[PDB]
Amino acid sequence: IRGWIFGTTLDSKTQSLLIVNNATNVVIKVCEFQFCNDPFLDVY
Numbered sequence: 124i125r126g127w128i129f130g131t132t133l134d135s136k137t138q139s140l141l142i143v144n145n146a147t148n149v150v151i152k153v154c155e156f157q158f159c160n161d162p163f164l165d166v167y
């Protein structure tokens with residue numbers, strides 16, 4: 124459980140917030156994300 128996605132439509136044309144949680148630091152980012160259908164991070 125490595126972060127969250129907040130928004131209103133979870134799409135473009137309106138903004139949304141993204142909390143991702145790396146091994147050293149959290150990066151909160153509030154941009155017009157074109158969110159995918161099944162969002163996941165991808166580690167080696």
Ligand SMILES: *[C@@H]1O[C@H](CO)[C@@H](O)[C@H](O)[C@H]1NC(C)=O
Nearest residue numbers: 143144145146147148149150
């Ligand atoms: C997480 O992000 C920071 C900066 O955004 C970066 O310095 C760090 O290396 C990243 N973590 C990993 C495991 O790559």
